[PDB]
Structures are given as structure tokens and as C-alpha cells.
Amino acid sequence: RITTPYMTKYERARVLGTRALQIAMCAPVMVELEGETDPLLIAMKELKARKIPIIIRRYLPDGSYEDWGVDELIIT
Amino acid sequence: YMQRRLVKSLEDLCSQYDLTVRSSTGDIIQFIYGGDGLDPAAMEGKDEPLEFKRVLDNIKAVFPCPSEPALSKNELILTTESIMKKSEFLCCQDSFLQEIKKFIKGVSEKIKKTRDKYGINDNGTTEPRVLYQLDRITPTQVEKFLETCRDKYMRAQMEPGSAVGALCAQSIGE
Amino acid sequence: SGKEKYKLLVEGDNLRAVMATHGVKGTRTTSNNTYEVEKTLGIEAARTTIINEIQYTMVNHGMSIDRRHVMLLSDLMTYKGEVLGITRFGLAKMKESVLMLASFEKTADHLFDAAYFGQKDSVCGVSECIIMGIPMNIGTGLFKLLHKADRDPNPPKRP
Amino acid sequence: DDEEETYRLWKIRKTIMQLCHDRGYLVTQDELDQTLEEFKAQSGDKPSEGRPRRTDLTVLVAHNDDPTDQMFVFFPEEPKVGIKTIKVYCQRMQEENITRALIVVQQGMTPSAKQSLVDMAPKYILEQFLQQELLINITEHELVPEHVVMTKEEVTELLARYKLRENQLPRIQAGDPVARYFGIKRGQVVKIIRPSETAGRYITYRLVQ
Amino acid sequence: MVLDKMHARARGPRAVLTRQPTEGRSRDGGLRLGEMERDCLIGYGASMLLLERLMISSDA
Amino acid sequence: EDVPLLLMNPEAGKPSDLILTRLLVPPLCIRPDLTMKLTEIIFLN
DNA sequence: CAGCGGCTCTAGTCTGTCCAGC
DNA sequence: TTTTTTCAGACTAGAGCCGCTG
RNA sequence: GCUG
Numbered sequence A: 001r002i003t004t005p006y007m008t009k010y011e012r013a014r015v016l017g018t019r020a021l022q023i024a025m026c027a028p029v030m031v032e033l034e035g036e037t038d039p040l041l042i043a044m045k046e047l048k049a050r051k052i053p054i055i056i057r058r059y060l061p062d063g064s065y066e067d068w069g070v071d072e073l074i075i076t
Numbered sequence B: 001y002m003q004r005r006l007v008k009s010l011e012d013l014c015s016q017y018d019l020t021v022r023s024s025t026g027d028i029i030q031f032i033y034g035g036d037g038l039d040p041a042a043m044e045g046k047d048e049p050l051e052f053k054r055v056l057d058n059i060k061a062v063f064p065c066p067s068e069p070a071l072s073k074n075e076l077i078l079t080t081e082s083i084m085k086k087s088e089f090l091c092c093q094d095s096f097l098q099e100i101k102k103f104i105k106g107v108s109e110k111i112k113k114t115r116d117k118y119g120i121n122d123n124g125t126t127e128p129r130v131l132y133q134l135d136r137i138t139p140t141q142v143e144k145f146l147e148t149c150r151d152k153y154m155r156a157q158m159e160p161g162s163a164v165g166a167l168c169a170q171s172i173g174e
Numbered sequence C: 001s002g003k004e005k006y007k008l009l010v011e012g013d014n015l016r017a018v019m020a021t022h023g024v025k026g027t028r029t030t031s032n033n034t035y036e037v038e039k040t041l042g043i044e045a046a047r048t049t050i051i052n053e054i055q056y057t058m059v060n061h062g063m064s065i066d067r068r069h070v071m072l073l074s075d076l077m078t079y080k081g082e083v084l085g086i087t088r089f090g091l092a093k094m095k096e097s098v099l100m101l102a103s104f105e106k107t108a109d110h111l112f113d114a115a116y117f118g119q120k121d122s123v124c125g126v127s128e129c130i131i132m133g134i135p136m137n138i139g140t141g142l143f144k145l146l147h148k149a150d151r152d153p154n155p156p157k158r159p
Numbered sequence D: 001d002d003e004e005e006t007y008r009l010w011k012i013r014k015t016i017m018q019l020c021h022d023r024g025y026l027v028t029q030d031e032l033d034q035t036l037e038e039f040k041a042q043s044g045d046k047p048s049e050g051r052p053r054r055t056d057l058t059v060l061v062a063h064n065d066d067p068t069d070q071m072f073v074f075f076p077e078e079p080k081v082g083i084k085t086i087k088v089y090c091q092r093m094q095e096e097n098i099t100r101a102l103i104v105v106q107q108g109m110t111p112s113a114k115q116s117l118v119d120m121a122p123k124y125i126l127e128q129f130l131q132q133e134l135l136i137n138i139t140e141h142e143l144v145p146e147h148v149v150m151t152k153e154e155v156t157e158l159l160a161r162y163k164l165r166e167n168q169l170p171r172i173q174a175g176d177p178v179a180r181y182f183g184i185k186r187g188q189v190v191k192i193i194r195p196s197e198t199a200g201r202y203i204t205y206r207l208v209q
Numbered sequence E: 001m002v003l004d005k006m007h008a009r010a011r012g013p014r015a016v017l018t019r020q021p022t023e024g025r026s027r028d029g030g031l032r033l034g035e036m037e038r039d040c041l042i043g044y045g046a047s048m049l050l051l052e053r054l055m056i057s058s059d060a
Numbered sequence F: 001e002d003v004p005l006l007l008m009n010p011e012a013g014k015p016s017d018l019i020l021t022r023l024l025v026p027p028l029c030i031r032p033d034l035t036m037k038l039t040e041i042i043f044l045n
Numbered sequence G: 001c002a003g004c005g006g007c008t009c010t011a012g013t014c015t016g017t018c019c020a021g022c
Numbered sequence H: 001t002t003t004t005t006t007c008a009g010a011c012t013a014g015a016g017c018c019g020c021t022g
Numbered sequence I: 001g002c003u004g
Helices: A009-024 A039-048 B002-007 B052-062 B074-084 B094-117 B129-133 B139-155 B164-173 C034-041 C044-060 C067-077 C088-092 C098-102 C107-116 D003-023 D036-042 D083-096 D111-119 D152-162 D177-182 E035-044 E047-056 F034-044
Strands: A054-059 A065-069 C144-147 D066-074 D100-105 D125-130 D146-149 D189-195 D201-208
Touching (some): A009 A039, B052 B139, B074 B094, B074 B139, C034 C044, C034 D177, C044 C067, D003 D066, D066 D083, D111 D125, E035 E047
8 A cells, every 4th residue: 555546657558458458359348338449449438437357466676566456546 | 879878777777666766686776766756747847846836826817716705814824734734745745745834834924914015904894895806815725726736746756667767868868 | 246256276187185285175175077076075975976067067058957867867877886987888887687788889798708607697677678579677567467357266165 | 384284283183083073982072173273282383293193192982882992093204104104003002902093194005004904903903094185074075965874773674664685775885985984894884864955855875885 | 752752561571581571662671660769668668569569560 | 616716607607618629500590601601610620 | 135016007909989761 | 012091998918116025 | 872
């Protein structure tokens, strides 16, 4: 819980990138997409509704780790 | 040639979740990036993050509150201290909190001089009501100013994994 | 106008002597050679000249720059004991991995000498993860990603 | 001259007092704060003020830890110091059972004498200072921060707070002037208090290696 | 003239020695993402983009 | 015992392998002038 | 009267000198 | 058998050197 | 050799 509450730009880019690849590979979409044919556009819509099934594991330099849910982290 | 030499020495450096810039070997080059921990791009005031005078002016104009108390001097400092000590702002670096208090103390001093020069409010009832508009800060503005300053500071922190070393090498070269 | 004051600027290198001659106030004498300062006033003053003499020559040419970049370049340059200038030679005293040195100058000697020693390098940084096609630990790689998919460590069956 | 030579023997002695006070040796404030005219009263011209035996100081005692712990500051008259001068100095130290001394050489030291100070004994440690370094107290120079030698109980908190090993800290050399001034040895940590551009301070740490 | 300076390559001839793309528009070419371009990508922090550009779309 | 103090990792190598007795001729994929040098070395042998 | 310690010195030598595009 | 065709640069050995160091 |  020591790590920053705000999601970093690097974290957002990877979460969207993995989610888009998962959606492009026929994963379930939780946003009821309306007229979207591009996986990256669908992934960004999921992040806005805070419904992405991914947990970010933040590894401290010593080797200890803390897991933050994508929904829990504040998105700027 | 110089940029290649700089980027072949500083590329490994990156900020970490512990806030310490470290080498690939794990040796600590720095304990906080630039001492403050702030990021050079996010600064709005010549190496200083907030530029408070501009922020307060935006707040007064964007949310000009008619039908508000417009109290000042002792009340302004009391409201500020109460807002500062409210669970949040503990995360903020202590030096930043002191800087906000110094700016607020300055605003309170300016209000007093103007109020003395042009009829001090006896209790907020002076007759030419235009005189109240001279240095008007209302309680909603004080709450908006302090929140905007906390968010602007928090978002100015260098993100962990920023590839801090690579950015510096390119920045020196340009 | 209020006070006319004289300061003598000497072109030369012996900072220790020029900071002791009777009448020169050593406490405020300074130099533009980090090597001379490092030898005479510790490493931490040699950090502050590398901050200053870059930020002095950068504002002289216009060319504004954040100090936080120079506060990083100086602090890299002097963190292993002594001031390690960024040359071919200072890279050997800064980095342990071979291919990051081998992608820089002297590719012949740095590869043979690290075969003479049995040099086990891990593959880190970016000058090796780009060569070995492994994603770098910097930036996006620092944080791993997990799936929140429906799972649990379940009970087993009775055997 | 004679005006200039006494000036050095006052400033060097004043700096040696300042070094002893910083290193934790006990020097009275009268020794720490003196004037050249007051120095003239103890000795005046270059003949009357003799560098070899007149200014030698064994007064310093480590009041914090050992009243017995004592330091001899020796100024050799000869400009370059041979082992023979060092051997005379060692014999004086051996009799008194003092284990530390400072030797303040005027121009230099001959190479075979320098080698002796490494190996005479680990339990008899002597530090060369050139007097040209002592004419200016570097701990009062505007570019040098405040250095503070950390205790083992504080080093154990530094390494716990960041979850470090010792060999990940930044390094400082033992040959470093400010390392020599405080007389620190390999494996001690120094706290360094860098001044900000603002009223604030930044704290950093280095390892002697 | 722009007509002679316009080049685009998708999948095309790869040199036998290194299996990387060709160096000439006439030979179908392929553009060199050099060290300076690679350095800018490291600064952006994009680990995946460097891997895709320098391994998958060059010589995996 | 004296190979460690020569600063050689014994598992990686040993002092004798520094001098050449056999040369591995390169795979033909890595050479679609090096081959000409190999023929000259064969002729010299 | 003899020796090896560091010096100190001149030259010696190998090492670079933007990205790519035709 | 007979010209040069950039400009530094901080490493690596030698050559001593003189003087204390025995 | 020239363009960038």
C-alpha cells in the first residue's frame, strides 16, 4: 500500500495493450460495445467503465510485491 | 557522437516504486529523483511545480461565488489550516504544505492592508458594497484552490519506471 | 556604485595553493576543473561543480534546461566513489554487463577480456535486452500483469 | 617575514583544533578561538616559535568514549619526512601507549616513509597532513556540505528503510579530503546534508570504500 | 521529384546473410530504425514497441 | 589451485585453451573472403 | 656505498569523428 | 631505391632521477 | 558525388 495510488502512464499502456490483444483473440467484452470494430477502441471503453479483468503486480526493488486492481487505481 | 555516449551510460537508470533511481546492478545512484521526487515536464513554474498566484486567479474567475460570505484575514488562515489537516495532505511532502501556508499567509496580509486602506469591514456591513470586491476570497474558492494544488502536485510526481536516465541523456544532447 | 570590489581571476590549475596564499579567502575560492575540485574538496563538492559548470555553460548559450536533468547526470557521474567521466573508459567502471560495453566502443577487447574471465552477465538494461530480443525491465516491463479471471485455490477431494 | 610564518602556525593550529573538535577530541574553546596576537604571546618570531617541538599537541582526548584515547599532532621541522623522523615519532607514541597521531608535514614526505604508515601497525595509525591543506578549513568552505559520521544503529535503519545491502550505497574514497578530515575508515557511512535552492534540505548517504 | 522518392515495403526480399530487409528502394529496401530512433523509444518507455519493431518486424 | 589466481574461471576456460591447436571452421550459413582465408590456412598447413 | 621506491617524463599507440536516404 | 593527403587523447609500457634507506 |  506504500506504492502510489494513481495508475502510471506505463501501467495504462500495458493494461490496454494486453486487454486489446485478449479482445482481438475473442475474449468476452464486458462493456456492451456499440458499433466498435477495433480492439484498442473497445479496450479503452472498458477502462473508462472500470471493468477490465487484470491485476497489476508492482514489484519493489528488494523483491517484495504489492498487487493493485485496475479498478482500485485512480485513472487520470 | 556525444548523444550516443550519454545514452550508452544513462539508459539503464529508471525510477522505481520505492522512489529511488537505481542502476540495473541495483546500486543506488539517487534516493529520490532531483531530491523533491518531482518530474521536470510536469513543472509549471521554472523548476517549481505549482506557480500558486496563477492557480488562485483561475479559481476566483472560474468559480466566482456571488451570495457567499467573503470573510477574510483571521478566517482565511483558520479555514486553510483546517483544510490542510484533513487526512489528505499528509501524503504531500511537508515542504510543499509549508509553501502553501506561506502563500496563504501572504494573501491574508494583502487583504488586511487593502481593508485598512479603504474602510475595514466592521463585520461585513460597510455601505459601498463595491468595496468588498477589492480582495475577494470566498470559502468555496479556498476549498477549490487547496484541492487543485494537491492534485497538481500529486500528478507532478515522476512515475515509477519513467526511464529517468534515458530522458536526461536525450535532454542534455538537444 | 555603493561598494566597488576587486576579485582576482587566476588562469591556472593548483587550487590548493591558490586557496592558501595569504589574502585569498579559501572559503569562497572555486574552480572550473572538476578533477582539481574533486582532489581538493571531496566528492560532494565535485558533484556540485558538475551541476554548476554544466548549468553555467548551458545558460550562457541561451539553452535553458531543467536542473533535474543535470542533478541526475552529475549524480550518476559521481556515485561510485570517484568522478567517472562518460568516456569509453568511464563505462567500464560503471557497468558490469558485457554486451552493453561491447555495443559501445572497443568491441574486440571487451569481448575477449570477458571471455578470459568467466563473465556471467545477466541480461538487463536496455542495450542487451534489445540485442537478445527480451522485453526490457525499464518502462512498461517494470510491472507484471495478472488476470482477475474467476479462480481460487480450491479444496481437493477426499482420497 | 616572521609575520607570515607565525600566521601559518596560528591558522594551522586553529584548523587542527577545529579538526579535533569535529573528530570528537576534547579541545577547550580558548584553544578553538585564538587570535594571532594571543598566539604571539605564547611565541612570536620564527626562531622563538619552533615548529618541531613547541606546537606538538597530545592534549586532544576522546572525551565521548575514552579519556585514555589520545591523539598526538606532530609537526616535523624537516620539509620532507623520512622513516627516521617517523620512527622517532613512533617511539614517543609507543612509550605513552597512544595509538593515533597526526603528522603535519611542511612540503611533503619521502616515498619510503609513506609506505611505512600503511604497515607500521594496524594498531598504530598515523595520518599524513600537508600544512598547505590545513591553512583552510574545508568543512567551512561554501561548496562542501555538512558531513555527519553515522552510528551503526543508524546505518542499520538506513539499510532497513530502503531494504538495501551496504554495497548498493554510493561510495566515497578514503583518500577523499573530507574523509581524511574526519578520519573515517572503510565500512563507515557518512550522512551528507546538501542545501536546496529553497530553505529546505536533501539528505544523502555514502559508503567509505 | 516525389514520384522517384516514394518507397513503401511490407514483406519483401530479405538479405541471405542476416535475414534482415534490403537497403535499397530498387531492391525493395526497408527502413533502418537506427540507434537514435531506438534511444527515443527507450525514453518513451515503450518496451513492446521496441521488441515488435526490432525483432518481430525485422529478424525473429 | 593456481588457475583462480590467474583470474580465469576454470569452468569457462583454462590457461592452455589460449594457444591454438584446432580452429572451428565456420558454419557455411555465416559465410555466403573468410572462406578464402580458410583455404590459405589449409594450404599453409 | 649501495639499493629500490616512487617519481616523472616523453613518446608511444589505438581510438573515435550524426542520421540516414538515393 | 622516390612525398603527404586531420586532430586530439588519456591510457601503456620503458628510459631515467635523485635521494634517502638501508 | 549529391539530396535530405
